[PDB]
Amino acid sequence: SMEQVAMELRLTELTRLLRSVLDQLQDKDPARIFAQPVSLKEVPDYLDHIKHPMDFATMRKRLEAQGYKNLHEFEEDFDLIIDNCMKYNARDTVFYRAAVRLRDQGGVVLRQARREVDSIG
């Protein structure tokens, strides 16, 4: 149907905007701490601690499959990156501190993304 196509165009455009958001957030992680999945070879107990691991590469795979239907779903995955790190790692660590900085800096990007998503529909 033409309606299904229009819906698909909307999803494609959301995907375009979320790709730009993802790029801007990942620039706030210049150490690449959150770039890839925590390695279960290197942290073999990780899944005993963290039940839903997340990282920027995994988000990008979902994004490119158009697997985010709305901004809320995308934000959920970004918050997992931060929140998983802040639980596994202690306050005095470069990992925790990186997550705090990513959260604080990302907030600004996400505030305007929400306005854009609502504005453009």
Curated annotation (Swiss-Prot):
Subcellular localization, as worded in the UniProt entry: Nucleus; Chromosome
Organism in which the protein naturally occurs: Homo sapiens
Domain Bromo: residue ranges: 9-113
Tissue: Highly expressed in testis.
Top-level taxon of origin: Eukaryota
Subunit structure: Component of some HBO1 complex composed of KAT7/HBO1, MEAF6, ING4 and BRD1/BRPF2. Component of the MOZ/MORF complex composed at least of ING5, KAT6A, KAT6B, MEAF6 and one of BRPF1, BRD1/BRPF2 and BRPF3. Interacts (via PHD-type zinc finger domain) with unmodified histone H3. Interacts (via PWWP domain) with dimethylated and trimethylated 'Lys-79' on histone H3.
Descriptive protein name: Bromodomain-containing protein 1
Reported function: Scaffold subunit of various histone acetyltransferase (HAT) complexes, such as the MOZ/MORF and HBO1 complexes, that acts as a regulator of hematopoiesis. Plays a key role in HBO1 complex by directing KAT7/HBO1 specificity towards histone H3 'Lys-14' acetylation (H3K14ac), thereby promoting erythroid differentiation.
Gene name as annotated: BRD1
Cross-link (Glycyl lysine isopeptide (Lys-Gly) (interchain with G-Cter in SUMO2)): K41
